[PDB]
Symmetry: D2
Subunit: 279 residues, 4 copies
Amino acid sequence: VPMDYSWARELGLIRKPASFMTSICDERGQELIYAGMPITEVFKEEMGIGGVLGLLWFQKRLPKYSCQFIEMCLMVTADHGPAVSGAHNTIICARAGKDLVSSLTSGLLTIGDRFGGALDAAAKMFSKAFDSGIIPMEFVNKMKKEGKLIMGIGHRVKSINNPDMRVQILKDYVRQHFPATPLLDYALEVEKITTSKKPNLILNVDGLIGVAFVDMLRNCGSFTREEADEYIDIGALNGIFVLGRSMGFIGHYLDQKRLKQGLYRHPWDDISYVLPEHM
Amino acid sequence: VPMDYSWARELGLIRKPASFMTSICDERGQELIYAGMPITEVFKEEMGIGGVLGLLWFQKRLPKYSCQFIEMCLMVTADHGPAVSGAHNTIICARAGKDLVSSLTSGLLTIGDRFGGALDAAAKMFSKAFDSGIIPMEFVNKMKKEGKLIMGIGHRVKSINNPDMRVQILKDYVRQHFPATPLLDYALEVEKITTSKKPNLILNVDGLIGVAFVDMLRNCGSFTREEADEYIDIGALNGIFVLGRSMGFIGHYLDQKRLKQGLYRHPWDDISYVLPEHM
Amino acid sequence: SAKAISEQTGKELLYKFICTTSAIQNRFKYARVTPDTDWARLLQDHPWLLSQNLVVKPDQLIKRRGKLGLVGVNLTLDGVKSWLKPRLGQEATVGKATGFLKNFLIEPFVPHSQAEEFYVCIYATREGDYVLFHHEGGAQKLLVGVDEKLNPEDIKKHLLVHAPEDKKEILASFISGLFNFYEDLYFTYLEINPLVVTKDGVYVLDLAAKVDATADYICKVKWGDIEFPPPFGREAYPEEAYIADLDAKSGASLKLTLLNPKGRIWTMVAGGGASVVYSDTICDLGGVNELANYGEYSGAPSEQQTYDYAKTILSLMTREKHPDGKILIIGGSIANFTNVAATFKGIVRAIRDYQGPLKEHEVTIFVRRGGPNYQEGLRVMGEVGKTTGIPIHVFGTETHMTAIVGMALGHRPIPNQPPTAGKSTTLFSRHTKAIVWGMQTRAVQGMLDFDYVCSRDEPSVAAMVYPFTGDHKQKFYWGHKEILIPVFKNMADAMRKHPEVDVLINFASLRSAYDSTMETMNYAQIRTIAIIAQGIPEALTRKLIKKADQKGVTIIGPATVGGIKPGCFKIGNTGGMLDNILASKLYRPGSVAYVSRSGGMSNELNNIISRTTDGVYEGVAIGGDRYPGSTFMDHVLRYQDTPGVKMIVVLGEIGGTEEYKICRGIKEGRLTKPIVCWCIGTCATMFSSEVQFGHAGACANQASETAVAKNQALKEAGVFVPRSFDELGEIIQSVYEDLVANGVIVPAQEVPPPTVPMDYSWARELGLIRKPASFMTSICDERGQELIYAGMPITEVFKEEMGIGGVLGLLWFQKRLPKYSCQFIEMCLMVTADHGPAVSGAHNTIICARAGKDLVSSLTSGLLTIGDRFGGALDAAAKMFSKAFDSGIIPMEFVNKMKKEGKLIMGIGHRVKSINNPDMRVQILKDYVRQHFPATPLLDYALEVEKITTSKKPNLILNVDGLIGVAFVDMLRNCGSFTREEADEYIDIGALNGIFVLGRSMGFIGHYLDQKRLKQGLYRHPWDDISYVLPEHM
Amino acid sequence: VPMDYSWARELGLIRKPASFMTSICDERGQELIYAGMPITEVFKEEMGIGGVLGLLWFQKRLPKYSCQFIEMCLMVTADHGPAVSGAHNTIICARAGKDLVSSLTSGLLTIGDRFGGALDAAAKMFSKAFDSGIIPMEFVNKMKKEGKLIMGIGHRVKSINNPDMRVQILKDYVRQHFPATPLLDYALEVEKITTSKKPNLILNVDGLIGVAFVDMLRNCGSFTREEADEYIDIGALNGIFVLGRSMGFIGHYLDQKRLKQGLYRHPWDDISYVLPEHM
Ligand SMILES: CC(C)(COP(=O)(O)OP(=O)(O)OC[C@H]1O[C@@H](n2cnc3c(N)ncnc32)[C@H](O)[C@@H]1OP(=O)(O)O)[C@@H](O)C(=O)NCCC(=O)NCCS
Ligand SMILES: Nc1ncnc2c1ncn2[C@@H]1O[C@H](COP(=O)(O)OP(=O)(O)O)[C@@H](O)[C@H]1O
Ligand SMILES: O=C(O)C[C@](O)(CC(=O)OP(=O)(O)O)C(=O)O
């Protein structure tokens, strides 16, 4: 009979290439390991959910202000009511008798470019202007002549002398605890220009978290500049919204099971049927 | 220096257990093989989409009426307008700028028990009643005493002397072409009982496809009795609706990209906020 | 708005920015003297004080200072010290106004003669800038055109005919340099008198100047923080500058000017021409000295902007107490687009914030207002009267406009019952199509509601142009039928697909309406342009006027609402909602055509002509700017050459000599129809010093430009002029009752219009219909002033230092959990965060990330594996141990029970770790639960089950799936927040399914981001790992 | 007491905007209508799954050659074995005990960039070469200088005197039945060039379905040239692969429930752990 593969590999007669690479977690040992740090030492130095998010997503032990800023961003992105396009889809799928995972996902896949995309779009827009060095007035003028609105600028109701309180909570944390916020100071000079046009055009919570996550990356001492640019490129700020808004989507799933809401069918009077005549 | 795994596997020194089994498709050769039948002979024998559905899902060369009945089921389940719970979620995800796969899926995941579940529920309910030997009057009286509505019985608009045409199209094909329909005759005798209560309580397209697919499985000669009963349990009529309704959900995606509809936010006056006082 | 700058501010702008090949002399040799300065600072900052003689002048915008004895010529520094002691800080009178002398300027003496003094003046007119010159300073005139330059060769031929031969080359290079300084820094006036040019160079001795203050967005870096002083006689107040700070940061207008801060009559009037009419009526009724402020708010300000404007007024009128009480006039005409509901909701919020001192000062509030959503505005303005005890008298459209002035001042009683109640002549026709520039959907729907009620065949708007979105179609209404109007990114696409369009309605901003109007005059189909924006600079408007004269394009505006032709066409928001179109009967023509400066008083002119006359034929609001695109005679000549008009109504203003062209057009026989006119701004001759009203052109530069002199001059011209605005409708009617008596006007039979259905939002807001809400929610509220998580606001979430587990208790359980319950939840999300890539869900996320999919698709592809076999033992161990514990069976009889049923205990049994080799995630969490939880009865049950299964195999310990499961039940059952029937529901509906999914999503996103870092290619499973067992030929 | 919304909307007292717009299906009448065709005449005219697939997706009556070509595309893209990245994920999710919808979806969401994205990419690439009119030799050399491989060219085993038989089946249908194939003849002239480099560089089934669906769109007479260009842009060939491969993914789900396969855990020696040291 032929030799077992596990016996041949253990005593080194053969070698087979590993088809997968991983870096975030080691679990074939005596202890679970998050990016080199064991699960017991994760809890002894009291790094939180934002602390293990720096281990799993960046393989870096972030400073305690960078951990606590990440947690602070997950509570402001946690929910924004049932009217948004993702929390709508979770409610429709929860009311159709589906499980938690199907209902979460059905609204979680609405996150993308138009819903939940302004978080990553404001980071990429402001970092492109700050690195390719132009003054904030030349950036506002550049966006206007190519017909692009600035992402992360503009709130529907909360304008000025009436500030968005999620923005003032997070901006107060960034000013005291972060050592240097160059892109935040750039983006706060951009809204000084756009609030001279309309009072509404302030930094969103989408545009605040976007430009302060970049300042958390390239000004905390853990990341090199090409590493901190890589995470904005591959979408680490997409995952901040997705992990944040998943908490309110699961809370939206569990809410429709409380209330025992039946199956939803959209009314025919809210739909405009413009079908072809016979084609 | 260690030996290759591929060299040791090809000329027979080592053995390694295969961790997967498949039986629907063989592609590691000169021709694509669908369940033992090559892709050239699939097209020479003029079996269609319902003919390859019998190969990929059941591994059987079904008769030409069974292949064509499957194709008729996929066209009546193809779409039922945008007001249903899945076509709603596809439209919301298409209007949120997502791709085809994300938009299809977000409404495809609503299919389950309340939306799209009456295909498999009316099959299992009527099969359980027919195999238990109870007459159609004793089945109607049984479900009344358990507080259960008969799945696949009932329509809200088209009742009697006013038939559902999708039901009458498919019942006509089943009457001429199927060699024996014992469960359809059972389900058409339950309909003669429930239509003496309300005119509305007729066989759905959900409930005629369910009982004629069971009659297609166990009375076409390809399947044994325990083998046809396995497909109803593992969810072959779930896949008939899901493959059928994917045809209209992609058309609902391509419609909202054609019409260039923007992002949907649900109106606040249609939502009833019943939040706690300060908890 | 031309605002006069000081002599110091103009000289420092000249010395920094002039470009002269001759050297300007005494550059920056100015020293500012205030009565609160230190002379040691001046002698250190500027060292030229001792070295030469000095002259001193008050920098208070005083003209003719040398003839009032306010210029001390050829004074040494010690003579300057003695000069200002009887002058600095006390009173003087210049004409009528009288004020303090608190700003003086030191500049060196210049030795010159009367052959050395010159005079250069550059001022802006409509047709260009006149450059003046005179040789005996102490006159040549040259018009430089709108897009024309001033060359030095042109100065020598015209301006310099009497200048001496050796001084021509030094003036013509200064005047050329002075003129480009005027154009680049946006001046509207620049006088240098005298200008001294000796052999040493050019000495600028005095400087009077005005700049176009609406050009601050252009000249922000050249002007700097430029300060516009108030005129001599009035002081500068920090509440005035607060409101001027709000005006410059939106398209809405917010003006405030304190005339007498101890005055008892305060006005908060909407509109810059409506507030002039209210100030005319107050000053007519003997309330000149008691009128406390001029101010207006217009251009549809928001609720927050109107709150900030109101709380400034209410804080200003509640400083000191008046014995007779105080009067607050919250007036205004019928608004066109200013939302009266949101406007008055900002005012009543300021009254509720100031109801304390408003009772002390005996403030009686009189309200008259019409407009969009005004019934909601007048409702909430009457509720705040009774709940705060302030006597608030609320009126509306049925009341005349300035009736609340007579009721407040005590001239007429308050009725108790009507509270709570080559230009072309034909610009517009029933076939007129228009293109709207911008997302003004309520404006476009208002035109479309106008057209259906006017029985038009097709809508007015053909296309919409918005450069910040792609080409699409937007759904509108044709009555009760929905239509689609195309939206275009480019103007050229709209003009090409729609050649039937001859009107552009330009809703671009003040910094976009110049380029959007230059771009649309490249298209020869557009014969009429309406510019809505207020705040375009006067130099940029005159280039629009210049090209409109060349292209033969009528321009209505800027700073206008547009105009309305009943039966044919309306521009944008003119006439307001359809409530006012039907009330003023603007769906069919009448015989009166009106032209008017202001657009909110046109909606009052719609109302006055409707109730006294068979209606309006065509009304045009030409805008409040200094240089409108079309004047009165651009429209009065059209109305004279129109057979449908039988009489004309003009509503002028103060400033400009436009209404004198109407006087000349009558004497030459060109205008023959009866004309009724009234120029508003009669109050401005009763004030001490000059006041700048809300409109950019409402400034009487001469004695003829006053509205008192213009109303007098139209009376000998045969124009029917009332004594005031409150008798304008009496004389519109009286001319009408003559034109019907002589048979000139035959009123047509009244035909009912095609009524539209009511809006749903309008019917829902005031409660005529009910519609059931098809959704319920409990976790989050976002249509408030603040985001709310289950009754708790977002600031109190962060104030009370609850974490991610704290908001998870709010979003999922709607409960304020204790701090150990919030922290145990976070620990469960940290141990379930990841368990390597070998598990089924982390596999699927890696395969989907290696296929090049996004974060959301890759996370989801592995998230959908969570279920029963992967990640299901968390909820399955909780339901199974709770069912055993609630059934009363002991832990031995539960181990025996599931042995007989062929069931392994969920949450018992770990592959490698055992008793005496403990799972560390279990030991971390069990130590938190034992020290912090009050009681753990199911954990003590599940650890007695574990004592039995570890006596079978040492391997069979509690998992982290079965520890979190039995301790989350103890978290729900024993934290005190939950009842048992409610805590059992959460386990039933799957709260521990969400704990695993939210925890493991953190490691699945980490598995997505890891495969993008490593740049792993597409995965394709080996064929030798798959055992193909396909049928033989079936 | 306020009037009903449904009553006031019925007698025309109020108006409310329809927030949705649809064109593909009308369920609210006496018969189900697929883009102007009732469900009865769909079955009278013997238009098949591909016939209703032109109704739901394009709102057009395609000719019977365009309907039957569309069906043959769904038959050849139906499955390609279990080892591809989507059929893997469906098998892992089916072995983890999940339902049909979740298992289909977990492998369906792999489709779009590197798995199954070459179908829409070969259409867009060859159309852009054909429209911006350059000869096939100047297209092969243009992609070489840009460092881009031609999408839809190249098979791992198949080549001349040994063709891909799915390609040969579909090419004979397009040659016999289509009236004009301008882009297929272009892509078969690009194929003559790349086969002179390596014999394996032939037209894929991803490449011939891509260029003959464009030839079906812009040469069947139903479509305007701007209409046919929009369907390629909004992803009509993304939906052809996804609706096709869903037959094999549901067949892969039903196969692992038949075989009763247990939960899959990947081997640890096929994964290469490259975690940081203690970061
Ligand atoms: C002119 C008017 C119609 C439109 O003004 P508006 O809504 O303030 O202006 P817009 O919406 O165009 O936006 C203002 C600026 O915000 C910019 N903006 C908007 N959203 C933005 C975003 N997210 N990011 C960046 N910039 C943004 C716009 O691009 C615009 O640019 P621009 O001013 O440089 O062109 C309105 O201002 C108005 O009512 N004016 C007064 C009308 C009036 O009084 N006329 C006489 C009445 S009788
Ligand atoms: N910087 C200066 N040096 C010398 N004389 C000056 C200076 N400024 C003004 N004067 C004198 O002031 C007189 C004119 O008064 P002026 O200031 O022009 O009155 P106004 O208030 O109308 O400007 C001139 O005769 C001139 O001699
Ligand atoms: O509310 C009003 O009376 C006028 C106004 O708010 C703004 C306006 O037009 O200013 P003006 O008339 O002074 O030129 C309006 O919306 O019409």
